Design a protein around this nucleic acid. Structure first.
Ligand code: MG
Ligand code: MG
Ligand code: MG
Ligand code: MG
Ligand code: MG
Ligand code: MG
Ligand code: MG
Ligand code: MG
Ligand code: MG
Ligand code: MG
Ligand code: MG
Ligand code: MG
Ligand code: MG
Ligand code: MG
Ligand code: MG
Ligand code: MG
Lengths: 101, 77, 131, 85, 132, 194, 99, 138
RNA sequence: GAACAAUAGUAAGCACAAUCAUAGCACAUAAAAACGUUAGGUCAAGGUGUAGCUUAUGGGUUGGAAAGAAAUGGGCUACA
RNA sequence: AUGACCCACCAAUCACA
């Protein structure tokens, strides 16, 4: 079990977006170019908008890995601040410490 | 250690001209595909095989639509 | 081999035996779990990719095809004979290599069944002597 | 959902609510009472309801001077064990 | 008040480990780290992975050795191999102890795809730093 | 049945060689170490905690396998694998007069399951232009061709190679780039008269 | 700016393997597109989550095999046991509303 | 008293090839706590003096990364907790080394790397000239 | 439950204090700050007691979440 | 200048045969 249904939906999003990455890259190469004719890029536009909605990278959310928290996440540990602080305050994160200066 | 990348050498990475052999030579498709080829030239994360499959997808997609290319105002091969 | 603390250190010979034997029985339990449910240990991390830490497959890779299942289930003793019996029921010819492997399996695994397997080795195929 | 779980101490401390503000000012009645029971009290190492017998844990390491192989109990045997617990 | 990772003062009878006797502001000052790995250094990668591994290791070791675990785990990571150092009460006969040493080492070696070392230090009862 | 055995420190001889006890990197078992060592913060009347059951001594990386005697022995066993350094090369002047070319290569070690470091690809090529056979025209044309990769004060040309998966591929591509730069610096063409 | 300089630049670009013919700022984006690893392909993206099903299922099995001991699940268990003893259980599917 | 007899069997071969020369070898050890990098610098310097490798050691300036989180689970934004990560550096600079000596010293050193420290090796190696450049012109 | 030219107070412990950090002292700052108080805040970090839903108070997909009569807090830019 | 009412101390464990 992924801790939440939300976490599940995001795992599916990352799988789909990993699968169609090549298609999207290749089509958006045509789409992002001035050199090609517009008649090609319109058809290429309908082609990339044809692709499954859940395969695009902007629908992916970085969530807390343990606790599923949608924000207040430290990207380096992929952890919610809460869980992070819990772990760090027990001495379980190497090199992390309280900051005095 | 553990990864040789198919015994490939840098010229099989850097110079992709060999796969641009079938393509219209003076057209805008040469502009486009030379940009694509340069991009794949700079790419550390892909093998030779995958770059080739990119080039071939573009071959097959451009050769898929002849109609829109001819109608476009430039006759393209 | 043994743990270094004064409590777990073997006092006598019988203790050395029971301790080491216990450690091995534990390793055996673990490996049993790995091979019973391989899909859990499938996901790989290590970059050099150690082949030694992968779960093992003791199942035959093909079912109804004889020439695969024979050798497959022989490498694994009774499933090998069920395979050879499923190959002999389909009128599939067993060559000089087939029951030379099934023979090496009759010697490695296994007094009536030896005589019967020998009769099937000689009567069906005219096996080259050297096997 | 495995990382989403906790220690038994934490769970009991949570469910009993002894340290709350209701206990101090006597904001709740004495006739209401609930207790903590150890859930590790009657359990032995290696025991599960799948019924396995492990050479170092459930059963003695050596039977009749040899090494016992990993084995599993009969269905009815496990029925009697669970009845006992 | 700060409640983080604190053992509150009791009536004065409460046995406390050196570990639990020091609040988060005492890490790197008095008490050290319970994990050692490179991933949290300036130019380094995969801190996230080492963290999730760590968590699972604590949970797992706690469940595999019920009741005999004395103090929180010490996890040392050196050049792809992890040495788990543990303080363990004397509860089980050494038979069970070795059984679980082997079983665990094997199981986690096959799970995390790297060599796993397990070092058990046995202690009569929880070592008491304070009160009591 | 409860079994308590006295520690190794009892049977330990005073002069017993230490590296025999700790050959490899070890967790620090307190039973196997003879020296009384008290670590941990003290208490107002009391002392720092003993070495037995102490978790803080377990957290510490211990250099006990690396005791100076063990380093002497180890390095005396490693004297066989090492090959000598050539005499005449002792000064940097002769290093430059003989070998003009420096190839910089980075290797990284970090603890964990995977060895793969994306920074390990990069191969840097530093070559002095005074050690090259270039013509006046060829040298000026080279300087103008490479541009930023050439240092005008120290005359050190730099080629930083990235684009390929392996450091050997990048090494080959760097050397090749150098070769083609030199071959194409000597060629005079039409527009060079313009 | 000269023609000599433009020829020199075309030569440096053709040589070092960079883009040869003059391009728009807008089109260079395709060069950039294939010069990198696309976002959805990075191990920091698709490999973000640990597999929670593997951990949960594995440790569940190991619990049933009597190796791992889960106090949290034990708690849940005994609580639910007493709850169905009290007379409040979970309704068998389909029964609850209409009845 | 009890001495195993004839305990040594090393295996070394000499290939006819011209072993790679290293003008300079920089080994940069990053760490969290200072004392470990001190005992490691002592160990490394001693191991270099025993192989006669002639090394210098200096200390690159330390890097402290700080960042801020909320102290409360729900809402007080005036209150924060500040966390540090301190990376300390030792730089072992070895000069005038060969390829074999480099691989032996780097093996020995890398085996004995402590769990909490990381290491970066920059080798600047000597090559005379490439073949096609020597003194041909096209 | 104190009187120091001392009259019933001894007290371990925890806080304060001291040390530690801000790379030398010092100062400053940071950090620390018990027991309790406000049934203070948070069942929507996560976990949970009790009580509730179970072809639905659960799981999906698609598209919508507007707006300024008014009042006001904190800011930014200004009035040169 | 004013500020519903209502708020508090009357139960005993764990472990073993
Ligand atoms: Mg939930
Ligand atoms: Mg987003
Ligand atoms: Mg009094
Ligand atoms: Mg007192
Ligand atoms: Mg100070
Ligand atoms: Mg001060
Ligand atoms: Mg403060
Ligand atoms: Mg203070
Ligand atoms: Mg309230
Ligand atoms: Mg409220
Ligand atoms: Mg909830
Ligand atoms: Mg929607
Ligand atoms: Mg306003
Ligand atoms: Mg504000
Ligand atoms: Mg009135
Ligand atoms: Mg009133």
């Amino acid at each position: 079990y992924y801790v939440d249904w939300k976490m599940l939906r995001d795992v599916k999003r990352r799988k789909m977006a990993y699968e169609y990455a090549d298609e999207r890259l290749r089509i958006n190469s045509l789409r992002k170019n001035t050199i090609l004719p517009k008649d090609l890029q319109e058809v290429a536009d309908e082609e990339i908008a044809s692709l499954p909605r859940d395969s695009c990278p902007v629908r992916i959310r970085n969530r807390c890995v343990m606790t599923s928290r949608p924000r207040g996440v430290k990207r380096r540990w992929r952890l919610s601040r809460i869980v992070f602080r819990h772990l760090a305050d027990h001495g379980q994160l190497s090199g992390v410490q309280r900051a005095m200066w | 250690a553990g990864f040789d990348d198919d015994g490939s050498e840098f010229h099989e990475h850097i110079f992709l001209d060999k796969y641009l052999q079938d393509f219209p030579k003076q057209g805008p498709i040469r502009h486009f595909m030379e940009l694509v080829t340069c991009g794949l030239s700079k790419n550390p994360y892909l093998s030779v095989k995958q770059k080739v499959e990119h080039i071939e997808w573009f071959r097959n997609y451009f050769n898929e639509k002849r109609v829109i290319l001819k109608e476009s105002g430039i006759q393209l091969n | 081999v043994f743990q270094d603390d004064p409590y777990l250190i073997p006092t006598s010979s019988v203790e050395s035996h029971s301790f080491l034997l216990a450690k091995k029985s534990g390793e055996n339990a673990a490996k049993f779990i790995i091979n019973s449910y391989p899909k859990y240990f499938q996901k790989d991390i290590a970059e050099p990719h150690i082949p030694c830490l992968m779960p093992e497959y003791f199942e035959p890779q093909i079912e109804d095809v004889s020439e695969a299942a024979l050798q497959e289930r022989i490498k694994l003793q009774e499933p090998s004979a069920n395979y050879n019996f499923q190959q002999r029921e389909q009128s599939e010819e067993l060559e000089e290599a087939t029951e030379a492997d099934n023979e090496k399996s009759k010697t490695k695994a296994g007094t009536w069944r030896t005589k019967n397997n020998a009769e099937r080795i000689f009567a069906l195929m005219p096996e080259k002597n050297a096997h | 959902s495995f990382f989403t779980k906790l220690t038994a101490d934490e769970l009991w401390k949570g469910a009993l609510a002894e340290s709350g503000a209701g206990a101090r000012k006597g904001r709740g009645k004495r006739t209401k009472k609930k207790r903590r029971k150890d859930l590790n009290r009657g359990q032995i190492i290696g025991e599960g309801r799948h019924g396995f017998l492990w050479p170092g844990l459930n059963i003695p390491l050596m039977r009749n001077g040899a090494v016992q192989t990993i084995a599993q109990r009969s269905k009815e045997d496990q029925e009697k064990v669970e009845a006992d617990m | 008040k700060n409640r983080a990772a604190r053992v509150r003062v009791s009536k004065g009878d409460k046995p406390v480990t050196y570990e639990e006797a020091h609040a988060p502001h005492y890490i790197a000052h008095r008490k050290g780290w319970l994990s050692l790995h490179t991933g949290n250094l300036d130019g380094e990668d995969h801190a996230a992975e080492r963290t999730v591994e760590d968590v699972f290791l604590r949970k797992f070791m706690l469940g595999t050795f019920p009741g005999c675990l004395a103090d929180q785990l010490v996890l040392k990571r050196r050049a792809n191999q992890l040495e788990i150092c543990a303080l363990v009460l004397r509860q089980l006969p050494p038979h069970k102890f070795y059984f679980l040493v082997g079983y665990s080492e094997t199981l986690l070696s096959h799970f995390y795809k790297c060599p796993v070392h397990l070092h058990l230090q046995t202690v009569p009862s929880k070592v008491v730093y304070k009160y009591i | 049945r409860r079994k308590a055995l006295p520690p190794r420190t009892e049977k330990m001889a005073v002069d017993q060689d230490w590296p025999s006890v700790y050959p490899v990197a070890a967790p620090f078992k307190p039973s196997a170490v003879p020296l009384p060592v008290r670590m941990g913060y003290p208490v107002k009347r009391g002392v720092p905690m003993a070495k037995e059951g102490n978790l803080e001594l377990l957290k510490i990386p211990n250099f006990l396998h690396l005791t100076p005697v063990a380093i002497k022995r180890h390095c005396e066993a490693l004297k066989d694998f090492c090959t000598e350094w050539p005499a005449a090369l002792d000064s940097d002047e002769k290093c430059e007069k003989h070998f003009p070319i420096e190839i910089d290569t980075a290797d990284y070690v970090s603890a964990g399951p995977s060895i793969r470091n994306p920074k390990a690809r990069v191969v840097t090529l530093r070559v002095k232009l005074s050690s090259l056979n270039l013509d006046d025209h060829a040298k000026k044309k080279l300087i103008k061709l490479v541009g930023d990769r050439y240092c005008k004060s120290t005359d050190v040309l730099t080629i930083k190679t990235d684009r390929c998966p392996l450091k050997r591929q990048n090494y080959d591509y760097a050397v090749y780039l150098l070769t083609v730069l030199y071959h194409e610096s000597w060629k005079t063409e039409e527009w060079e008269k313009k | 700016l000269s023609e000599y300089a433009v020829r020199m630049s075309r030569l440096s670009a053709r040589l070092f393997g960079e883009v040869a013919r003059p391009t728009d700022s807008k089109s260079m984006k395709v060069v950039k597109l294939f010069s990198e690893q696309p976002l959805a392909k990075r191990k920091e993206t698709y490999d973000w989550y640990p597999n929670h099903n593997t951990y949960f299922a594995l440790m569940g099995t190991l619990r049933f095999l009597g190796l791992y001991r889960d106090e949290h699940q034990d708690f849940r268990d005994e609580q639910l046991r007493l709850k169905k003893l009290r007379g409040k259980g979970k309704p068998r599917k389909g029964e609850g509303k209409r009845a | 008293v009890d001495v195993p007899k004839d305990m040594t069997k090393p295996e070394i071969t000499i290939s006819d090839e011209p072993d790679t020369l290293y003008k300079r070898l920089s080994v940069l050890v990053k760490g969290h706590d200072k004392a470990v990098l001190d005992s490691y610098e002592y160990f490394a310097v001693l191991a270099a003096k025993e192989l006669g490798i002639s090394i210098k050691v200096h200390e690159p300036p330390r890097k402290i990364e700080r960042f801020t989180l909320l102290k409360s689970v729900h809402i007080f934004k005036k209150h924060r907790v500040q966390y540090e990560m301190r990376t300390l550096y030792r730089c072992l600079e070895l000069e005038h080394l060969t390829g074999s000596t480099a691989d032996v010293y780097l093996e020995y050193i890398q085996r004995n790397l402590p769990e909490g420290v990381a290491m970066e090796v920059t080798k600047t190696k000597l090559e005379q000239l490439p073949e096609h450049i020597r003194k041909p012109i096209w």
